[PDB]
Symmetry: D3
């Protein structure tokens, strides 16, 4: 498990969705 | 205007939902 | 096996269409 | 730090992709 | 101004072109 | 083989550079 620091709630939510997306693709 | 994006496969449907949500957060 | 994603606005519709095609190309590598 | 978050990421591949994507996002937002 | 991005593999080239299409639309 | 993608704008050049790296990471 890794931890990516994200400043800003906007980019946090988007990066969450992008992570979930990468998982779906894999 | 409301559009409907055709998508083949459950996997990509779910991804595009997340990408659509991400666009809306940016806009 | 076919799904439909409602999208508000032609601009996002067009963006998502290209993003879908990117996904499909990546998945075919 | 009230608006600073830590995204929990399973596996090193996705972690490194997400760092690139994060930087991409920040570039688009400037 | 015009830039050139080095890409290895024609498949990845086509993927990046599609991603570039997306990026330009998002920026309008 | 090596190709060169033409990109208008420094912004998209740097982004697409990051996207290329991401592609290569997924393909490893």
């Amino acid at each position: 498990t890794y931890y990516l620091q994200v400043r800003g709630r906007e980019n946090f939510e988007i990066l969450m969705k992008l992570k979930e997306s990468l998982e779906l693709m894999e």
